[PDB]
Chain length 310, copies 4
């Protein structure tokens, strides 16, 4: 709908891509070597419509870690297998202000912040071991990606775990406040958490995952039903209000599209009933969002009138 | 679009209306006599589609004060006459946490909280006197309402002003933090603010105002352009995230529609490109939102799949 | 006690005075002209022992406004005429963190912050008019000063009132939270508050007031009982923990003496059962405390072992 | 000084002891079995003057864990071996408001809160192993106690460590914020921390430790110099403002004596240049302070005029 000529739309994406390219500011994350390795010049943009029409430009086949971009995905999985009610007995449904803490009900504010993602992680495939849990999610991500590139970075995982003092603090804190389900191995969940953060994708395979969320839960390149409508709706609501760290407020105001950024430089973008996208460029701004990515998103909406309330 | 039979849709509204009616909980605001006067049993619901199709049920012709429901409206007017950039040099674009204060830039968090509404009020028709300012806005509201009922409550105004110690505190505070434009008569602005809060409407005339916002700024019963597209988009974004007091987060999550509640018991609802609505029922919940109104909104979305991300 | 030779003690004060003099940093308050007028070079130090032995050095006879230095004094008066229990039904007994707000009981944190001082001001000589109230306190201050210099600055008063937007905000806020006694004219109390802030003294007359607090409530140069033992004890406790704005914590730690600073550059110091002091020097530091004054206080304690726990 | 007849003073202590006894309210800590074991009726009070005069009443020989009562003690040790400047490059010097966090300089607010105690613990006898560290402190406590009862509770230690999720969260958090000295084994420090909390004493041996702090750092029953004057002064200042959890403000106001309470029900009290005391009674109030202990302290000051500013 509302394209209506993909061919010409593609020309405008390449133009926006070229415009963003000139934006060289930002700093590449360096709290671990696996992130510092990256070149500030890498810049890719992949699109995947609700039909299955594709289009890439730039470094769209270089693997990078999802990092926080995986948060909305595992949240979607949890809702899908447990439903809205159960999942939210453990995590909130809205944004907070700026810090490590819980809301008035002693629950993480939402699934998009670390504390929430950690709790969400303790809800998935409970009972089985980490290997089975990890495998189960990889299964899911493959279906969301229509079987395209979905790898894993052991180096990232090892570095994330060995330097995640803050996530461990959050871990013990949540355990103290009784935020996990009965009989949870907190340290085991953090391990699972670090692993999920280390899953690798490319702009191309990620854009398909986004397209699945944009297509009411159906993978546009296989037609298969991956996530329940409830799961997709919840995920998009939270991506709309809590997906860009502290820039979420302004992003929702000026762009108005469900999105989720990651420290690796990615930005999982969704245009409901239209397309899925993945912008990637290592240099991040003060807010922690890909500089070229944010610039691109602004241009995209101020060109194709995609804003939620346009 | 997506109705497609108004006749049958109307039958479902009356059913939802009847269901909400059974909800008798809540307390009628009583900080001033003009609000305490109201009967907890008053309950009206008016709809006005993007075409101009109407439908009411219940006490839809009993005048009541807009109160906070006027906030998105005057914000729309300001953006319309001054543009996004200017207006936001004075007020934020996002929700806050729970208190009287400003954000990191010493500006009210958004136009939907008192401090913000007060600042927005100081931007409209600057220079002229209060009588001209008030008249100017009444002009605007008449156009938004397609000339339907738009009155004024002097009793409310007098009570609001004589008992608004908190708004006066906010007033002096904003003056101290230099939040108003050069040469602003703060006390005069609060007066204007109290007056705007006292403007009266009925569910029927209000639903038309909502319909105008739902119709990209065009009044659906006169076809006239009232607000600029920019103004409408900004207003809806802020209504989506900051329109239900502290219930905004959950409302956005479970209902996902731009809305604004008032202490008088009203709820200005908007379904983009579809219809405008006004629910009214004096009994409010702990959050300050009309009990019958909130119940109705939940049912409406969980029936007609109107949620922003359905 | 523990002097034991005033003559030699005096020599060390002059030496400390000379050392502080070299400290030229700081900025003179300038939010109103009456404060900006002052020369950064003014520097006086007056002592008044528990006996009545005096000693001055520097600009000890130039009148300056008490400003916040009057807070502990009016608090003392209130306790004296109403007792600990009554006064504290309206104001707290301890320091807070960094902002305009009340504690868990909706009361100002303590008498040393503006909100608290304003509430304390509404408790004194209730019923009578401002002229009688003002006169009553002047009476008290004369007795505390042993009839030495106690004037008034109308220019300061007029400027304080015409530019005190923040105090007015606090005023309306306290009125809203019902922090004043039944039937209080809030605006009248702020007026009284501004007047009290405008009372003038000299280092010499102020040091006698301090000496009275140091002498269990007896003016050391007239022997008269001015304040009740209860009043003096409460005042000193609060001066020890809340008398130096945000520097109170560190002052209590490194100096350990009851004290109260003012924006005029004064520092009302008290050495229990030994002496009273008044340091004055317009240039203030980031914390709002007289630079030469703070330097002097540190030296005084690190020389005569006057620290509360030495 | 100011007794002047110990014999008669003792009679008044026994009377205060008897009065407190009637206070049966409170709840015995039960987060671990070692604390829940205790009888709510246990109640002892031991005094040890600056001379060496002793006096006990009640259950003064039943061993109990210092718990937080050890905080001022290890702080004293650190200052003693490292001096004020070094120790405070890691921890603050003042009270905070109500939560897990650091001050504007990313340091624990003070040595009396957990985060601070943990950091202080990482400063003592750096380099050596835990066994040597633990032994070193036991040495110190023996000297402070004049060789009286100083034991250890392995059961408490084991329970403290196996259930201290919050302290572990604080641990990882401090490590993340770089609050420990270079090359610190955080987990090893928490272990040391739990051990220190498990050291046992009796009211009698503890009162001697308090007496040492009251005697400028000299153990009143051996005459030996245990702590440096600097160490003692710093410790008392912090005990005066941060020793009673959230009741510190009011304690400082109404009692005005350096003190430190513990979850075991103890209250290490100090009357500078007069005596040391240890009150013990398992039942704690909402604030976490021994009910009989707080009652006793109030009576003691309102009888013997011991308040800092009496
Ligand atoms: N994308 C992110 O911000 C995640 C960063 C890091 N892996 C964490 O979990 O804290
Ligand atoms: N609807 C509202 O909550 C407004 C209440 C009141 N008139 C105010 O401005 O504070
Ligand atoms: N000494 C002071 O800080 C007082 C300043 C000013 N008169 C006020 O009351 O706010
Ligand atoms: N006395 C106390 O409050 C200490 C309790 C516990 N051992 C802790 O360190 O948290």
């Amino acid at each position: 709908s509302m394209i209506p000529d993909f061919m010409s739309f593609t020309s405008h994406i390449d133009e926006l891509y070229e415009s963003a390219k000139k934006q060289s500011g930002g700093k590449v994350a360096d709290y671990i070597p696996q992130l510092a390795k990256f070149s500030p010049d890498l810049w890719g943009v992949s699109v995947c419509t609700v039909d299955g029409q594709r289009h890439s430009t730039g470094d769209t086949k270089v693997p990078f870690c999802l990092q926080s971009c995986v948060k909305p995905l595992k949240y979607a999985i949890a809702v899908n297998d447990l439903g809205t009610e159960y999942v939210h007995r453990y995590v909130g449904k809205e944004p907070s202000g700026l810090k490590l803490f819980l809301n008035e009900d002693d629950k993480p504010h939402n699934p998009m912040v670390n504390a929430g993602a950690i709790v969400v992680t303790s809800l998935i495939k409970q009972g089985v071991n980490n290997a089975e849990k990890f495998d189960y999610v990889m299964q899911f991500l493959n279906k969301m990606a229509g079987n395209e590139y979905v790898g894993f970075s052991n180096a990232t995982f090892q570095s994330e775990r060995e330097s995640g003092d803050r996530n461990f603090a959050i871990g013990y804190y949540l355990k103290e406040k009784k935020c996990f389900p009965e009989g949870t191995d907190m340290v085991g969940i953090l391990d699972f958490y670090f692993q999920l953060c280390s899953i690798e994708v490319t702009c191309e395979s990620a854009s398909v995952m986004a397209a699945t969320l944009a297509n009411g839960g159906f993978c546009p390149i296989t037609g298969e039903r991956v996530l329940s409508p409830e799961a997709v709706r919840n995920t998009l609501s939270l991506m709309h209000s809590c997906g860009m760290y502290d820039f979420s407020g302004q992003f929702a105001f000026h762009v108005g599209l469900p999105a989720k950024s990651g420290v690796a430089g990615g930005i999982l973008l969704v245009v409901p009933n239209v397309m899925g996208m993945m912008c990637w460029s290592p240099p991040l701004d003060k807010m922690g969002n890909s500089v070229k990515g944010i610039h691109f998103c602004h241009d995209l909406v101020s060109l194709c009138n995609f804003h939620n309330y346009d």
